[PDB]
């Protein structure tokens, strides 16, 4: 009221300010009644209408006894003068009798609130569309269409709730006030709510799609079988090679965007109160440089930095973690903010404040220019979402069934992985003991022989959670020992006495990582039990205490992270150095000629690690070349990288002396600076 009174013009800003108040007026609900019914979801604007007419709201005048007074219901149900052979048969007869006698008198006051709801929304369509001309307006009228369609169903659903607890009350009163069936099972004459409600009205406010579908990117073929490319249902442009690849995160195909390859569609937010976005899955190989141009915002992913430019505003660079494998990203455009989400782990990545007003209602294009090596897209949906839709409450993972490594590539049968524990990370190395009968997690730094892991199923290559595996164990030399179980200990067995292990997806409390518990068919879960200061056993315990079976996952508490394992790849060890041409006297640290290193699992480590030794120094005073050996000493192999640092002789002096010029003495350089010599002199 005070918004629509103190207004001579509706701004584009006040369009959003109004539609939130109409959504808070016509979609607001008072929840609880708790007598004459429990689920009584009455809209707020109708009880205000009953408050203005009768002084009290509708709960305070059903209690008074004015339900049949204010609904103009002037009739009660009656049994027939001859009841059937089965009093079960007057179960729907009282549903037809109550519909005619009493519900159509409720339904005729639903008619009046449907007319008052339509005449109010007609007025705010009149007060805004005549006082605001702007590109946002079609979003306001489209959203008033959505609030009207939803409030007309919320009004519809509320009379069924009023109807159900009136039908429930009239059927008790029709057989308590009769001697024919005075004592009888009234629950044989009543209906449950979802058979009463779906008999009257098949659809309610729960059946409304609040937003239009998500516009899947797809390859297709014409009637002339020409390779078109859809975005939902409408063909879009395509500029380069977009072909299919079996390289997927699951056993589906995937799209291969080649170098400098782009499609271009169109999109628009239908409503004002919506966030719009791009949901897409891709394999994050190195040197990816793609760029999505969505709703006049360019979001350029480049070398694990995010650049977001609004059209006509400053480019802002955003630093993320190194995205390692298959990533699900959502490029959300909100009001006044652009947000990038990881949907594997359900965390925020980038949040860029929009400095210009963002209009998502006009049609703006959707590009994806690839700009570097071949982007393996899996999905690409352009959706439109609720503005207060959280990505925090969703339980994390691909929700796929495939078991992934910590670097989010799927596990293939073979391929020599590495079991890591969650208690003790990458620094906790799986190995064999002195007797070569147990696998042991040793957190030493002098571990002799690491033990890699090979899972195998004789099924599909991407290993499912639903399939049991055998876990071979191969050391640095190639001794293959299958893992088995005796006396509740994980030991080494032959092939024929191996045991089916069932990897199950799990999470522990205060982390965002996806772990795996390893169980058997008998619910015996591998625990990492500590036996020495630096040595851990793998002993099976029956079930996980205080573990919650969620959807298919286990929610481990922080105290039961023994059972949480994860898997890393191997042979990803790297060390890259450069050759820096120094000068005589110019300083050198060991991190100057070091570019980038990487663990056996692919972790980007630096020179401050206790595995990279720099054997050699320089002088920077004598002219001679100096070779510095950088060396990463792994768990099994040590790779050394030569880095030579020349010290080129520099003799750089620009010796000067002072001068006094004469009467307007034309000036050149040569009268002052006297001795200038280069590096070699």
């Amino acid at each position: 009221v005070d918004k629509l009174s103190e207004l001579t013009s509706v701004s584009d800003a006040e369009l959003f300010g109004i539609i939130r108040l109409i959504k808070n007026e016509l979609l607001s609900v008072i929840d609880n009644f708790t007598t004459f019914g429990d689920n009584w979801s009455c809209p707020r604007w109708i009880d205000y209408c009953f408050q203005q007419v009768f002084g009290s709201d509708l709960k305070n005048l059903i209690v008074q006894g004015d339900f049949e007074k204010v609904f103009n219901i002037s009739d009660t149900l009656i049994l027939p003068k001859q009841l059937p052979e089965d009093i079960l048969q007057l179960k729907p007869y009282l549903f037809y009798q109550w519909y005619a006698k009493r519900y159509t008198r409720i339904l005729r006051l639903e008619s009046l609130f449907y007319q008052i709801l339509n005449e109010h929304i007609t007025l705010i369509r009149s007060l805004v569309s005549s006082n605001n001309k702007g590109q946002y307006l079609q979003g306001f009228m489209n959203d008033l269409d959505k609030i009207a369609y939803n409030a007309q169903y919320m009004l519809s659903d509320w009379t069924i709730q009023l109807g159900y607890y009136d039908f429930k009350n009239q059927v008790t009163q029709v057989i308590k006030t009769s001697s024919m069936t005075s004592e009888f099972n009234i629950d044989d004459l009543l209906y449950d709510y979802d058979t009463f409600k779906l008999t009257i009205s098949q659809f309610g406010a729960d059946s409304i799609n609040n937003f239009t579908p998500s516009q899947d990117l797809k390859l297709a073929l014409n009637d002339n079988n020409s390779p078109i490319l859809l975005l939902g249902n409408d063909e879009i442009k395509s500029n380069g090679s977009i072909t299919q690849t079996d390289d997927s995160l699951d056993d589906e195909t995937s799209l291969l965007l080649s170098k400098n390859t782009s499609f271009e569609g169109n999109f628009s937010a239908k409503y004002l109160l919506s966030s719009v976005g791009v949901n897409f899955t891709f394999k994050s190989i190195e040197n990816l440089n793609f760029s999505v141009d969505f709703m006049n915002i360019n979001i350029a992913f480049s070398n694990n930095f995010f650049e977001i430019t609004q059209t006509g505003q400053e480019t802002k660079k955003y630093s993320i973690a190194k995205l390692f494998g298959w990533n699900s990203l959502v490029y959300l455009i909100k009001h006044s903010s652009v947000e990038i989400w990881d949907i594997h782990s359900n965390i925020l990545l980038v949040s860029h404040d929009l400095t210009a007003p963002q209009n998502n209602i006009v049609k703006a294009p959707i590009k994806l220019t690839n700009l570097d090596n071949e982007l393996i897209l899996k999905s690409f949906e352009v959706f439109e979402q609720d503005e207060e839709a959280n990505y925090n409450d969703i339980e994390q993972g691909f929700k796929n069934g495939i078991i992934y490594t910590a670097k989010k590539m799927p596990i293939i049968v073979g391929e020599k992985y590495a079991l890591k524990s969650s208690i003790l990370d990458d620094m906790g190395i799986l190995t064999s003991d002195e007797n070569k009968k147990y696998p042991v997690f040793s957190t030493d730094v002098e571990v002799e022989s690491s033990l890699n892991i090979i899972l195998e199923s004789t099924t599909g290559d991407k290993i499912s959670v639903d399939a049991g595996v055998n876990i071979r164990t191969i050391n640095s030399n190639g001794e293959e020992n299958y893992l088995g179980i005796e006396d509740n200990h994980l030991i080494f067995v032959p092939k024929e006495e191996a045991e089916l292990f069932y990897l199950k997806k799990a999470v522990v409390e205060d982390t965002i990582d996806i772990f795996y518990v390893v169980k058997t068919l008998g619910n015996m879960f591998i625990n990492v039990e500590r036996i020495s200061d630096n040595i851990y056993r793998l002993n099976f315990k029956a079930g996980i205490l205080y573990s919650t079976m969620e959807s298919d996952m286990l929610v481990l508490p922080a105290e039961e992270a023994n059972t949480a394992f994860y898997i890393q790849p191997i042979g990803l060890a790297s060390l890259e150095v450069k050759d820096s041409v120094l000068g005589e006297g110019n300083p050198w640290l060991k991190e100057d000629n070091f570019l980038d290193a990487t663990d056996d699992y692919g972790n980007q480590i630096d020179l401050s690690d206790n595995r990279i030794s720099v054997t050699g120094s320089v002088d920077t005073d004598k002219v001679g070349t100096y070779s510095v050996v950088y060396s990463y000493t792994g768990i099994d192999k040590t790779n050394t990288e030569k880095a030579t640092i020349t010290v080129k002789l520099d003799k750089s002096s620009i010796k000067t002396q002072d001068s006094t010029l004469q009467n307007g003495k034309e000036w050149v350089r040569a009268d002052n600076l006297v001795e200038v010599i280069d590096e070699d002199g």
Binding site: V63, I347, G522
Partner: protein, 1335 residues
């Protein structure tokens, strides 16, 4: 192994001769010793003295004494009681009808029975075993080694107790013969302390300020024979504090004393501001309340009605500030921290060649490693972060969840005077069986324990008066009654970075993901537990006192406030009970006039109290009272519903308020809605004044300034140090700024609004005690008719029975409004101002870096290589931080942790719950034959192995229950929560039992029983409450614990081989039944007969068909229909299900049916075109009747082949693409093929799948996650790529409908018009050929 107790009695002889050669000191167990105490004198001056005490080494490092050291007078007279019982006679004289020696013999046998209970709880939980180890067997190291202790000497005053013999020359026990390993000392409460006061103290506190990491053995002054009463979470159900938890609260305090992380202290000696929380009441003189964060971490109890708690990210901030210390701008207020005190202690051994037993003594003390070369301790700044983090791995709240014993802090004890606090606990079972060694106290109901009889009982109180008025409000003197103070804004300034500045390195900001698993404690049997080193100490009286935890403040502050605080509004809203009501309560609608009468009750000006101030009209009899009281109940529920408002401060969001909150600003609930137009964020505060002045929301954030560079040397190496260091402090300033911003939000906003959430639930509970007493006074109105009082008093007791659920509904809404307000103030005010300030910090520091780098290069103070190094460095480092995203992920992990707490909230809880609210996790943990075991350890499962099985099945595992056609009503599975203790019985108990049930069709009406819940009505007594059975040819949920005991016929056919979910919400009055997610009906209009507890048995009986069960659950309170629908959808997870309710499987023979007709495909006469034909129904007998149910075995069967074939038992999830292969002919698969020779031009056909075929890849519509059924979508691709629109007919997705002449396909509409109407999805059903279904 762990609490392995020595053969030591009270009657065991003391050590009087040692001889030093024949016998070991490790075999001495009773001896005289010396413990450092905080003695007092006649002056009241404290001094830290040593006291002689006879010790008794009851276990391998644990000593107890029975002496009550003369530590000065109490100052409080004998047999008085402030809140703890003060006496001077206990363990000094004859006290309460027993001699000194009998008190001394009982205290030995009493403490040794408490530790007997802990040893029985050592083997039943790994989490208690890891505690008693970490606390008894630990190596303890203290830093500033005193006089008479050499370096490289493993036993000194920190971790040993002296063994004293008596002199020949005099009777004084001071002839030291050695000192053995000490971890714990349990003495009685001393002379200067009350009888019931448990207090933990570090054993040795040296002179000077305690260093963080300086460990000590801990002394506990604890008496297990006394307790104080507490008002439990169960409202006005008073209980007794369990003394076996009161010791575990102090050992938790004492584990911090062994690690050194218990008294964080700055350089000036005081506690830092980040280590306490301060309350405040301002007025004539200021009153404050300090609650240290070590107390908040020892009782880290996560409930709404407990102020003594911190979040997991605020805990980690305190854990990380103990580890790395915290430099302030004033360096006398900096904290040294653990890492910078262990590292300053282990560098004294850097060139000294310590021994092997001393090296292992430290390497297990601090997790460090020692190399034989270089003679030094390599200290690791991750094993010390792991050292401080593992000091707080457990707390009194986690002990009370393992041990099902109820608790409340001494720091939140409200004197609601039900009488006397101090009770006598009988731990030796002298009068009745009170305390076992297997189970603890067999009750906490204070009718067991004998109450003490004091002479004077003066509760301490905060006396608040309004300035110009006259009414004293004696609040409790606890943290709840004070305004929680804002944390001081930091205001980060410049650094002036040089090449030699030792800037911090181990600073971690907000940590998002951390495994907080306390690493297991390795034992070392090859380490000495004593030393035969007579070295005299300095036992001179140090002037001061020792830091004692859990000291109870017993003063009373009088403050004359200016403004009425919410705690006071809460107070005067209470009926002021204690009287018998002669006149009506003088209900007063004005707050500033209630403080003028000292007899009025402040009622808010709502339409619930204005109908209570004006009574019922007595002219109308029972009917007018039912309308009056009934309307008041409805008008109180209107105050409980959260309603959204709008603020100009919060863009794009509607903030929430409860109508009740007007009570705290004395508004009419419609003038209160007026005040949110033209408003600020300093509204939404019900508690916005400390008593003197306005105290608004501290949303202001300190400004962060860029650092300077000042080179003191002009070398090229000095600038490469300075240009490197400037980026290093740039990252350090951001990591401290985003961490200071989390603690400003989590304290000033989230903790302030959560405290105003619980000040509202208190005040709403207080005004509901005014509704009760006025409706009860009006029910005893003599003007009413005497047979109308039978109807009127029954109505007052019926509106009262709805207070339970009203106050749950109010608490779930007051929490949800104030949590979403604190969530929205973060997203819109705090995190926006962090992002706005750090954007100017990133930009100005980059501008400052790249104007000194180009200045130093052009001048020539840096090389060309170094200029190119730090230009690529500024491009990669001076960028938008990921710590403002880590600040987001921190603040939205605390909110999710509290959005989950509100979802599982119960007014009354008994068992340790889940995060879903469940208290049961039956699992089938068996090698070959599965024995069912509860995984939460709350329940005890009896499973008759002849019939109860456990299979793979529904979601993970089912409990199959076999037939018994011979003997009816035999319990075969019984999941009990009944220990045999005495619980708080109430009629006002709600719960929610819930289980999935798959039962085939039962042909017989044998009038058996399926299932019976039976709640605990006493001590090893149980009344049946909810019986599901076959009663008259229909399943009936009967009822056995109501005053009238109605039944409820399950009309929907639940036994048709399909997985149903039966939820029974048993409130007091109503019992709602749910099938899956729809309310089948109620049992109302009757209350509970016998009072019950929230413990009980889940007796599942034998039936005459093999039925199954799954997710048998029990919730401590009611579950909404909203929350039953949400639980039901999330129970199904990400799978697509059969009709039977079992997950779909690839390579499985599925009858594909239509879900509306149940009509199935069929080939046209000879061709491969499909025609949907109807599947005939089944004439069954269901419980002896003649039901006619849906038939499912008709027509064509279809596998779902995946895209590259694996094997059968893989499950189908939402988003899994497959290929429907015919089974009757294996070489044919479903495809959608355009023919243009039929009426339907784009029919659904069976095409050949041999070789490179273009069979259609199908899927299910992911965006419609149905249960029991799904919508097929022809994806439009094949295994050879996308299908040609010439061959197919269309190009994209096709829904598969039941319409020929459309060709059973319609286009999936994704245009901007598809949600203008209702979608009309066509559901399909997959029935596999099941063996419990015949047609």
């Amino acid at each position: 192994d762990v609490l392995e107790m020595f053969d030591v009695n009270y009657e065991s002889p003391i050590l009087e001769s040692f001889d030093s050669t024949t016998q070991s000191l490790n075999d001495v167990h009773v001896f005289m010793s010396r413990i450092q105490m905080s003695a007092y004198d006649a002056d009241g001056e404290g001094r830290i003295e040593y006291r002689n005490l006879k010790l008794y080494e009851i276990s391998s490092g644990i000593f107890i004494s029975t002496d009550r050291l003369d530590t000065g007078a109490s100052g409080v007279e004998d047999d008085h009681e402030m809140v703890d019982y003060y006496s001077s006679a206990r363990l000094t004289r004859e006290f309460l009808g027993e001699s000194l020696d009998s008190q001394k013999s009982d205290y030995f046998e009493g403490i040794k029975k408490v530790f007997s209970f802990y040893k029985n709880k050592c083997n039943e939980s790994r989490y208690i075993k890891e505690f008693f180890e970490e606390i008894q067997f630990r190596n303890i190291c203290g830093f500033p080694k005193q006089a008479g202790t050499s370096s490289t000497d493993i036993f000194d005053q920190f971790n040993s107790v002296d063994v004293l013999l008596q002199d020949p020359v005099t009777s004084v026990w001071n002839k030291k013969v050695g000192s053995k390993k000490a971890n714990i000392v349990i003495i009685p409460p001393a002379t200067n302390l009350p009888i019931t006061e448990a207090c933990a103290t570090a054993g040795f506190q040296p002179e000077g300020f305690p260093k963080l990491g300086s460990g000590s053995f801990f002394t506990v002054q604890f008496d297990p024979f006394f307790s104080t009463r507490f008002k439990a979470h169960e409202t006005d159900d008073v209980a007794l504090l369990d003394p076996t938890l009161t010791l575990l609260h102090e050992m938790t305090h004492g584990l911090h004393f062994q690690k050194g992380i218990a008294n964080p202290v700055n350089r000036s000696g005081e506690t830092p501001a980040w280590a306490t929380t301060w309350g405040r009441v301002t007025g004539d003189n200021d009153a404050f309340k300090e609650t240290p964060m070590e107390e908040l971490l020892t009782f880290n109890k996560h409930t709404i009605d407990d102020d003594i708690e911190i979040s997991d990210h605020l805990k980690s901030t305190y854990i990380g500030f103990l580890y790395n210390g915290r430099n302030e701008d004033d360096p006398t207020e900096s904290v040294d921290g653990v890492y910078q005190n262990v590292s300053s202690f282990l560098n004294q051994y850097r060139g000294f060649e310590i021994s092997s037993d001393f090296q292992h003594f430290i390497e297990s003390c601090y997790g460090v490693k020692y190399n034989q070369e270089s003679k030094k301790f390599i200290v690791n700044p991750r094993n010390i972060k792991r050292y401080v983090q593992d000091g707080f791995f457990i707390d009194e709240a986690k002990f009370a969840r393992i041990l099902n014993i109820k608790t409340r802090s001494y720091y939140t004890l409200m004197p609601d005077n039900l009488g006397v606090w101090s009770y006598r606990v009988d731990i030796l079972n002298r009068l009745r069986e009170t305390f076992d060694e297997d189970r603890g106290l067999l009750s906490q109901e204070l009718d067991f324990h004998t109450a003490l009889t004091p002479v004077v009982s003066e509760n301490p109180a905060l006396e608040l008066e309004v300035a110009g008025m006259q009414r004293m409000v004696s609040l409790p003197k606890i943290k709840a009654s004070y305004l929680p103070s804002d944390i001081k804004i930091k205001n980060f300034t410049g650094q002036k970075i040089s090449h030699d500045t030792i800037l911090d390195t181990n600073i971690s900001g907000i940590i998002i993901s951390k495994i907080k698993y306390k690493s297991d404690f390795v034992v070392d049997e090859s380490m000495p537990r004593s030393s035969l080193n007579t070295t005299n100490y300095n036992l001179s009286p140090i002037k001061g006192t020792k830091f004692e935890t859990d000291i109870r403040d017993k003063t009373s502050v009088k403050v004359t406030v200016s403004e009425i605080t919410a705690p006071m509004i809460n107070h005067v809203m209470k009926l002021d009970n204690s009287k018998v009501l002669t006149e009506r309560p003088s209900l007063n609608e004005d707050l500033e006039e209630t403080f003028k009468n000292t007899k009025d009750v402040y009622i808010p000006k709502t339409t619930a109290m204005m109908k209570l101030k004006e009574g019922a009209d007595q002219t109308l009899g029972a009917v007018g009272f039912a309308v009056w009281s009934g309307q008041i109940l409805e008008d109180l529920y209107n105050l409980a519903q959260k309603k959204e408002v709008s603020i100009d401060q919060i863009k794009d969001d509607l903030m929430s308020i409860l109508p009740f909150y007007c009570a705290y600003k004395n508004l009419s609930a419609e003038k209160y809605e007026q005040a949110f137009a033209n408003a600020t964020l300093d509204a939404f505060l019900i508690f916005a004044t400390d008593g003197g002045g306005f105290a608004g929301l501290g949303i202001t954030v300190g400004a962060i300034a860029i650092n300077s560079m000042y080179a003191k040397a002009e070398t090229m190496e000095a600038y490469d140090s300075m240009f490197g260091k400037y980026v290093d402090q740039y990252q350090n300033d951001i990591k401290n700024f985003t961490l200071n911003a989390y603690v400003q939000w989590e304290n000033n906003i989230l903790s302030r609004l959560w405290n105003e959430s619980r000040l509202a639930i208190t005040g709403f509970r207080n005004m509901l005690k005014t509704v009760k007493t006025v409706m009860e006074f009006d029910a005893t109105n003599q003007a009413y008719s005497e047979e109308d009082r039978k109807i009127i008093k029954a109505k007052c007791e019926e509106i009262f029975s709805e207070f339970p659920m009203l106050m749950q509904t109010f608490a779930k809404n007051s929490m949800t409004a104030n949590l979403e307000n604190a969530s929205k103030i973060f997203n819109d005010i705090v995190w926006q101002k962090i992002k706005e300030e750090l954007d100017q910090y990133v930009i100005d520091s980059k501008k400052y870096f790249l104007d000194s780098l180009e200045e130093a290069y052009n001048n020539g103070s840096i090389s060309a290589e170094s200029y190119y190094k730090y230009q690529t460095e500024a491009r990669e480092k001076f960028v938008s931080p990921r710590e403002v995203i880590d600040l987001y992920i921190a603040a939205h992990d605390t909110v999710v942790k509290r959005k989950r707490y509100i979802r599982r909230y119960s007014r009354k809880y008994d068992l340790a719950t889940d995060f879903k609210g469940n208290t049961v996790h039956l699992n089938g943990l068996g090698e070959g034959t599965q024995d069912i075991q509860d995984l939460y350890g709350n329940y005890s499962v009896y499973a008759d192995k002849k019939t109860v099985s456990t299979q793979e099945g529904h979601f993970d595992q089912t409990i199959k229950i076999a037939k018994d056609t011979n003997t009816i009503n035999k319990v075969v599975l019984a999941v009990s929560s009944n220990n045999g203790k005495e619980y708080a019985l109430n009629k006002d108990e709600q719960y929610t039992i819930s289980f999935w049930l798959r039962m085939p069709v039962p042909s017989s009406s044998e009038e058996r029983r399926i299932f019976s819940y039976s709640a605990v009505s006493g001590v090893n007594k149980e009344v049946e409450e909810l019986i599901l059975q076959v009663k008259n040819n229909e399943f009936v949920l009967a009822t056995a614990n109501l005053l009238r005991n109605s039944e409820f016929v399950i009309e929907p056919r639940i036994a048709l081989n399909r997985w149903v979910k039966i939820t029974i919400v048993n409130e007091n009055t109503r019992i709602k039944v749910y099938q899956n997610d729809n309310l089948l009906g109620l049992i109302k209009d009757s209350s509970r007969k016998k009072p019950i507890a929230q413990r009980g048995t889940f007796k599942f009986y034998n039936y005459n068909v093999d039925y199954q069960l799954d997710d048998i659950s029990y919730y401590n309170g009611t579950i909404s229909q909203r929350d039953i629908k949400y639980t039901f959808k999330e129970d199904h997870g990400q799978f697509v299900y059969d009709h039977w309710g079992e997950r779909l499987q690839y390579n499985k023979a599925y009858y594909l049916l239509s879900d509306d007709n149940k009509s199935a495909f069929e080939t046209v006469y000879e061709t491969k075109r499909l025609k949907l034909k109807s599947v005939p129904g089944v004439d069954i007998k269901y419980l002896g009747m003649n039901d006619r149910v849906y038939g499912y075995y008709g027509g064509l069967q279809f596998k779902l082949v995946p895209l590259d074939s694996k094997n059968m038992n893989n499950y189908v999830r939402w988003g899994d693409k497959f290929t429907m292969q015919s089974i009757e002919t294996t070489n044919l698969s479903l495809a959608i093929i355009q023919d243009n020779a039929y009426f339907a031009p784009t029919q659904l056909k069976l095409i050949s799948n041999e070789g490179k075929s273009e069979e259609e890849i199908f899927t299910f519509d992911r965006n419609i996650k149905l249960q029991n059924a799904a919508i097929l979508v022809g994806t439009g691709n094949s295994k050879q790529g996308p299908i040609s629109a010439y061959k197919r007919g269309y190009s994209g997705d096709l829904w598969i409908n039941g319409a020929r002449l459309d060709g059973y396909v319609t286009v999936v509409n994704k245009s901007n018009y598809s949600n203008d109407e209702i979608q009309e999805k066509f559901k399909w059903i997959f029935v596999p050929k099941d063996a419990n279904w015949v047609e």
